[PDB]
């Protein structure tokens with residue numbers, strides 16, 4: 001078109017246009033005050049409106065990158081506030097914008113955003129609803145410069161709905177609070193996954209990414225032809241590559257194009273794209289990415305026919321190794337949407353290895369004939385882990401379950417920091433409840449989606465402050481042996497217990513007046529500390545001490561005299577316990 005600006009305005013709409021402009025500027029000029037950005041957004045918005053009325057109006061023809069960069073260099077304190085970045089303005093558009101991307105701070109040092117009081121929030125909302133949401137939109141954006149703008153906007157709207165509903169409730173807090181905790185966790189998971197996909201692409205390369213995408217896509221579209229999956233896996237890989245680099249526009253168009261291609265060739269891909277393809281430009285991509293698995297054709301022949309028994313398997317394999325393997329993946333994937341993606345790549349890798357040994361032997365059709373038999377143990381392992389952990393989670397309840405893990409992992413890596421072991425075991429328990437609630441069918445895939453982010457959030461910490469060679473062994477290992485490696489860890493027999501510390505086991509009656517969250521985090525921290533002091537304790541010796549401490553609380557926080565009870569009755573517990581646990 002003649003006007004790129006007028007064009008984006010026209011289909012985005014004024015409301016979405018304005019919110020995206022704000023997020024965009026906030027992600028670059030992360031140091032300017034909110035009132036400053038509002039000024040820009042309005043400036044840009046009024047311009048856009050000019051072009052929509054006459055695509056010929058001066059400058060209406062400039063490119064978005066050009067118009068954007070031009071406005072960015074308009075900032076007067078640019079050099080004084082950002083310094084080096086101001087030098088970008090000396091370059092010409094190809095490099096200028098590339099320069100801006102470079103000087104983007106992924107982890108700025110801004111103060112943690114504290115959550116105000118429901119009533120203060122609801123009142124700010126009611127008075128000035130817009131500036132309330134835009135002010136917070138701007139605060140999240142400057143802190144997460146690499147969060148895909150359109151998706152940040154999708155969360156924004158979900159927030160506006162919670163305040164809309166809850167601030168009318170008789171019991172606002174009971175309404176709002178649990179919704180905000182939910183949204184918080186979601187956006188955090190989304191942020192991590194997005195940062196994870198770009199990391200792997202860099203570390204493991206295109207091949208591994210391609211295989212992950214193939215198994216992934218073949219699961220959602222079991223009816224498409226390998227040729228179609230091939231095409232998509234190809235465009236997709238370019239999209240993530242683009243998107244990871246950073247340019248919002250390049251990444252936005254790449255996704256739009258691919259979303260339209262999928263919708264046009266819809267009948268050629270899946271039957272569950274009905275909705276997503278009827279949706280607005282801004283939501284088409286996001287919808288599709290979240291789409292449910294299409295029913296896999298019911299008429300699907302065997303795999304042993306084309307991969308184990310037929311004779312020219314080596315002939316077809318040597319001719320094009322990757323397409324053959326991609327074919328195995330596609331076939332096995334679309335047949336098993338109840339498998340995690342890493343389980344599939346774990347099977348594909350096993351097969352590849354086997355073909356490499358046999359296609360170079362007297363009679364291969366008999367060297368690789370017992371491969372499928374080697375898949376059995378690979379599949380049963382993650383499966384036996386799910387039942388076992390969901391069975392347990394059922395006999396205990398989230399909290400009591402989180403406690404079981406605590407004892408488990410503290411024993412494995414006692415070297416790890418207590419506040420870390422607690423945070424980790426808490427997130428694991430959450431995964432236990434978020435997934436064990438599904439039928440066998442969707443369990444494994446659920447666990448992988450969640451476990452993936454936790455294991456990495458956990459590995460990144462260790463990165464900054466190493467502690468155990470072992471946790472480093474698994475953290476550096478292949479993204480396919482990441483989880484299996486952690487499950488393989490064994491009780492540390494090397495570790496040397498910590499010297500007693502009464503202060504660590506001294507409780508004053510403030511716990512009785514603390515929130516559930518706080519009481520638990522407090523009892524849980526003593527638990528980690530208790531295991532670090534007496535590592536060889538039994539599940540019995542422990543369950544006992546935990547019973548005595550259990551009652552204790554009730555006896556001192558339901559008694560006329562608190563701190564005395566907590567200091568006179570307490571001395572009794574530690575004295576007895578210290579004896580029981582030898």
Ligand SMILES: CCCCCCCCCCCCCC(=O)O
Pocket residue numbers: 505523524526527530533545546547549550573574577578
């Ligand atoms: C050296 C022995 C000191 C005894 C201290 C006991 C601390 C254990 C706290 C465990 C609390 C379990 C939580 C619960 O009962 O719900």
